[PDB]
Amino acid sequence: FPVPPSVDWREKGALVPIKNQGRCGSCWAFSAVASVEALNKIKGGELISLSEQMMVDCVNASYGCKGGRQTDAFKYIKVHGIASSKDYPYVGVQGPCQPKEIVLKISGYRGIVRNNEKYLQIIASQQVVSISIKVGKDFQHYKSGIFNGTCGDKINHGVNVVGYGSENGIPYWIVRNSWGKGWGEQGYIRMRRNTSNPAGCCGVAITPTFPVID
Secondary structure: OOOOOOEEOOOOOOOOOOOEOOOOEOHHHHHHHHHHHHHHHHOOOOOOOEOHHHHHHHOOOOOOOEOOOHHHHHHHHHHOOEOEOOOOOOOOOOOOOOOOOOOEOOOEEEEOOOOOHHHHHHHHOOOOEEEEEOOOHHHHOOOOOEEOOOOOOOOOEEEEEEEEEEEOOEEEEEEEOOEOOOOOEOOEEEEEOOOOOOOOHHHOOOOOEEEEOO
């Protein structure tokens, strides 16, 4: 599959502004939701901010502010759909599953073969990808540049690949986080790409997933 050398889905109007999950352990929901929002736009829909709060409150296979799985959210959005952030705002605390207008459903999700950054790049060239990484103190303290710091010891944080590129010949992934616009490069981190360890930087390539529509 012909692969462009750089991609940035933000330049294509496929990312809503950076959000902030607060103290709640809802990264799984933010990582699933951003991929769904982007795909809806990429496939010819309008860009709409969608409700992570609805996922936290309604996806009983996951654990609300106690952690969860991007794929649990994808399954829920396929069957039951998802409401807008406007109708179901984020409060950062689990509450009852509240009924609101459904914006959209998806049709399913897929994974990528594990530990294959070039396969991740192929999907990333086509849409936003959900990924799971091993965050430790160096990642938490990231401010700018291409991150090459140390990593945590356990997969513990869900984020998104929104593109990729290179700077002075050093390749990177553009990674969306859910820690507000004041963290990193306006809420994003560029992480080193094509590392010798096939798991990728802090495990970016271990378990990528992405929604499908139609």
